[PDB]
Design a binder for this molecule. Structure first.
Ligand SMILES: *[C@@H]1O[C@H](CO)[C@@H](O[C@@H]2O[C@H](CO)[C@@H](O[C@H]3O[C@H](CO)[C@@H](O)[C@H](O)[C@@H]3O)[C@H](O)[C@H]2NC(C)=O)[C@H](O)[C@H]1NC(C)=O
Ligand SMILES: *[C@@H]1O[C@H](CO)[C@@H](O[C@@H]2O[C@H](CO)[C@@H](O[C@H]3O[C@H](CO)[C@@H](O)[C@H](O)[C@@H]3O)[C@H](O)[C@H]2NC(C)=O)[C@H](O)[C@H]1NC(C)=O
Ligand SMILES: *[C@@H]1O[C@H](CO[C@@H]2O[C@@H](C)[C@@H](O)[C@@H](O)[C@@H]2O)[C@@H](O[C@@H]2O[C@H](CO)[C@@H](O)[C@H](O)[C@H]2NC(C)=O)[C@H](O)[C@H]1NC(C)=O
Ligand SMILES: *[C@@H]1O[C@H](CO)[C@@H](O[C@@H]2O[C@H](CO)[C@@H](O)[C@H](O)[C@H]2NC(C)=O)[C@H](O)[C@H]1NC(C)=O
Ligand SMILES: *[C@@H]1O[C@H](CO)[C@@H](O[C@@H]2O[C@H](CO)[C@@H](O)[C@H](O)[C@H]2NC(C)=O)[C@H](O)[C@H]1NC(C)=O
Ligand SMILES: CC(=O)N[C@@H]1[C@@H](O)[C@H](O)[C@@H](CO)O[C@H]1O
Ligand SMILES: *[C@@H]1O[C@H](CO)[C@@H](O)[C@H](O)[C@H]1NC(C)=O
Ligand SMILES: *[C@@H]1O[C@H](CO)[C@@H](O)[C@H](O)[C@H]1NC(C)=O
Ligand SMILES: *[C@@H]1O[C@H](CO)[C@@H](O)[C@H](O)[C@H]1NC(C)=O
Lengths: 240, 328, 40, 47
């Protein structure tokens, strides 16, 4: 498990080195803010129907009475270019906040905890996550248990032993085709079916697809081996 | 999950086929490039939203031909092979109930084409047949494999043993399923019956998808009607100005129309950017519900329907997703 | 010898899962995997 | 039963505790294992 974690962290180094695409979600936010600023600055070059976009040339080439009519145009068009930019930035900031509140939620639930939320803390069953910082962002290294090599097995919802029906306490009943076992839900580790691994409810009739198998009682060999010590004491007591 | 991908050309809208008006529009600099970019960003995001909600499974799972799900009858939510589009029975109720609103928008605004006002409706990246095939894979995975196809490969489990794994999840012992399995299957079948009956009978229930179609329809009505506004010019028809006046007396009139129209687009694009943010919030919630109610069982109270959550079944709708949540 | 090609996209690999009313798959082994996720 | 339950402390600490018997399934097994034993002893008083 350590060697798989150590190997998987080795693939994180290789991935983050090998492709420029890896941090695309951060680079897209730098690129959109750079684009929005570069556009806002280019609107200073626009005429808006004044005789020049250069405010000092308008002021040099015209007297006060005419210059106000040209500068009114430039103010109206530049003011709309700020109100455009600031609307894009207020809307953008809401997408970055939603992302920051999600990142704060993943910090709380994947780093400071362990999450039952499926596919929230990465793909697979969540073990734990490690934060790493990035330019204007956060990277989570999510560690997950992924089940990897399955066998098929025959299975049953219950066992009948003494006409009473038995169910797993935890895990599931499985067979290799010759014997019946109980095993944990996410990892094949078979065990003999016992009165500790199983709980009883009702007769054998009501459970659809139930199967007959022995259920071992772990106290029975204690009372049988204690009965053979008792039988040796009685047989010995025939002899004096 | 999405809204209609609408791209307006800011040049076509403001100055439709007038080179005179186009030469004047250039004096305002980048605003039309910026407005076409803004709408294109919204259109790309509709595919992102739809892919994040539905494409959560990387294999297309088939349902078995032998329908022995322990007495549970998924026939109303699995694909009907006999239909042209391979939708479920319940997905066709959802499809007809919202397409009776879509067809209005499509004829007012399926090889869609640009109108003379510059309005264009683009197709989604995923056809309704591809959303049905992803939704089939999610449902076929759920009923054959339980939550395991969310975490690993799909691992088969018998459906009544899956429902026992689920009953343990809500803190009910698994014999309470098996001792009652015909009753649990009959109540499930009767409840999927009531979903089907309700979706056929109801006027109001799909209002949450009607609203998204109606807002986009009304914002395009408003945007197109503002082409009739004079903005104090001698006419609101652009050719009727260039016919009547000369190369200098016209420009004062054309610039009025450029100013007012451009403001009408700047308004529409702001409503649409704020809207797209609300549909992306709804898509991120739908993606979270798909991941936590379909690909797993949720211990989050009331997140997957009013009850204790067992499992959920996704169904496609036009512009949306429906979850049939199953609850104890 | 490369060219621009246009196609109907595949949604993913096909899989008919071997379901039956009495059969289960259980993993003998597992992979620990570390997946990066990046948030602005 | 003693399987359905677990023990901690004594009666005086829990507000609103109630007296009832708690059954032990090891016990009637051990009593059946006494009645199997006592009949043996009694038979072996006989010869
Ligand atoms: C199903 O799982 C069973 C438990 O692992 C397994 O049974 C066990 O099989 C091995 C042989 O593969 C037996 O090993 C003994 O075999 C003979 C018995 O006479 C001896 O000569 C050997 O030295 C050795 O002791 C186990 O005793 C046996 N366990 C039981 C409880 O019977 C089955 O073989 C598995 N079946 C399949 C189809 O996988
Ligand atoms: C699981 O184990 C059970 C106990 O061994 C077994 O039940 C037994 O089944 C047979 C056949 O149904 C019954 O035999 C009787 O059948 C009728 C009367 O019902 C008569 O014609 C026969 O002469 C005979 O009396 C047994 O009585 C019955 N035993 C009990 C305690 O009910 C199940 O059949 C086994 N099932 C499987 C799938 O292994
Ligand atoms: C678990 O078993 C299933 C079905 O049972 C087997 O089917 C035959 C292949 C034969 O070996 C029988 O004796 C078995 O009982 C397996 O499903 C088959 O998988 C193969 C690919 O490996 C596929 O080509 C077949 O179409 C499948 N069979 C059917 C009836 O469709 C399944 O692969 C086994 N699981 C594992 C993990 O090995
Ligand atoms: C699953 O439920 C459907 C009904 O929703 C069942 O189909 C009906 O079957 C009866 C008997 O053949 C017919 O009289 C009905 O007209 C059918 N209705 C429809 C809509 O097809 C179907 O048989 C059920 N499947 C199982 C396995 O019980
Ligand atoms: C479980 O999977 C691991 C790999 O994650 C297997 O470990 C490898 O085993 C082979 C021999 O079978 C060795 O050559 C490799 O060097 C091992 N790798 C590591 C990282 O230890 C392991 O054998 C598998 N076990 C089972 C029971 O399938
Ligand atoms: C436990 C149980 O009912 N198993 C049945 C089996 O008897 C039947 O042959 C098969 C056919 O689909 O379906 C399953
Ligand atoms: C029988 O009991 C006597 C003590 O009374 C003891 O010394 C002897 O070893 C016993 N033998 C066996 C086989 O129990
Ligand atoms: C419950 O309330 C009554 C008074 O109405 C009181 O006499 C009794 O002791 C209370 N029970 C417990 C367990 O506190
Ligand atoms: C006592 O047990 C013996 C066998 O050990 C038997 O022959 C005899 O009949 C029994 N007698 C009584 C009265 O139990």
């Amino acid at each position: 498990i350590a060697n798989q974690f150590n190997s998987a962290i080795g693939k994180i180094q290789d991935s983050l080195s090998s492709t420029a695409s890896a941090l695309g979600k951060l680079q897209d936010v730098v690129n959109q803010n750079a684009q929005a600023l570069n556009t806002l600055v280019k609107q200073l070059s626009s005429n808006f129907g004044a005789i020049s976009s250069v405010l000092n040339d308008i002021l040099a080439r015209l007297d006060k009475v005419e210059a106000e009519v040209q500068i009114d145009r430039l103010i109206t068009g530049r003011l709309q270019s700020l109100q455009t930019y600031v609307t894009q930035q207020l809307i953008r900031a809401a997408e970055i906040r939603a992302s920051a509140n999600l990142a704060a939620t993943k910090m709380s639930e994947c780093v400071l905890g362990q999450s039952k939320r499926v596919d929230f803390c990465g793909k697979g069953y969540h073990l734990m996550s490690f934060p790493q910082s990035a330019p204007h962002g956060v990277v989570f290294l999510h560690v997950t248990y992924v089940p990897a090599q399955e066998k098929n097995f025959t299975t049953a919802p219950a066992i009948c032993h003494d006409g009473k029906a038995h169910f797993p306490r935890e895990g599931v009943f499985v067979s290799n085709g010759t014997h019946w076992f109980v095993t944990q839900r996410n990892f094949y580790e078979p065990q003999i079916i016992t009165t500790h691994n199983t709980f009883v409810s009702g007769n054998c009739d009501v459970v659809i697809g139930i199967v007959n198998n022995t259920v071992y009682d772990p106290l029975q060999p204690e009372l049988d081996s204690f009965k053979e010590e008792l039988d040796k004491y009685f047989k010995n007591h025939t002899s004096p | 999950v999405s809204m209609t991908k609408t791209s307006v050309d800011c040049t076509m809208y403001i100055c439709g086929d007038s080179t005179e008006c186009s030469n004047l529009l250039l004096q305002y600099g980048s605003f039309c490039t910026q407005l076409n970019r803004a709408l294109t960003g919204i259109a790309v995001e509709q595919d992102k939203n739809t892919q994040e909600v539905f494409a959560q499974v990387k294999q297309i799972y088939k349902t078995p031909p032998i329908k022995d799900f322990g007495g549970f009858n998924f026939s109303q939510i699995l694909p009907d092979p006999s239909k042209p589009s391979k939708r479920s029975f319940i997905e066709d109720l959802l499809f007809n109930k919202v397409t009776l609103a879509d067809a209005g928008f499509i004829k007012q605004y399926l090889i869609c084409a640009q109108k003379f006002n510059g309005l264009t409706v683009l197709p989604p990246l995923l056809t309704d047949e591809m959303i049905a095939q992803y939704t089939s894979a999610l449902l076929a995975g759920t009923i054959t494999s339980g939550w395991t196809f969310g975490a690993g490969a799909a691992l088969q489990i018998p459906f009544a043993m899956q429902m026992a794994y689920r009953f343990n999840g809500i803190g009910v012992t698994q014999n309470v399923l098996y001792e009652n399995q015909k009753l649990i299957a009959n109540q499930f079948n009767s409840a999927i019956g009531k979903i089907q009956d309700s979706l056929s009978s109801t006027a109001s229930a799909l209002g949450k998808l009607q609203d998204v179609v109606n807002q986009n329809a009304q914002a395009l009505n408003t945007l197109v009607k503002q082409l009739s506004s004079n903005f104090g010019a001698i006419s609101s028809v652009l050719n009727d100005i260039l016919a009547r006046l000369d190369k200098v007396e016209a420009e004062v009139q054309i610039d009025r129309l450029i100013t007012g129209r451009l403001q009408s687009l700047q308004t529409y694009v702001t409503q649409q950017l704020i809207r797209a943010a609300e549909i992306r919030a709804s898509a991120n919630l739908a993606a979270t519900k798909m991941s936590e109610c379909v690909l797993g069982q949720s211990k989050r109270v009331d997140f997957c329907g009013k009850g204790y959550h067992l499992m959920s079944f996704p169904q496609s709708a036009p512009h949306g997703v429906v979850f049939l949540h199953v609850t104890y | 010898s490369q060219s621009i090609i246009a196609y109907t996209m595949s949604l993913g690999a096909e899989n008919s899962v071997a379901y039956s009313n009495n059969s289960i798959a259980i993993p003998i082994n597992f992979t620990i995997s570390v997946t990066t996720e990046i948030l602005p």
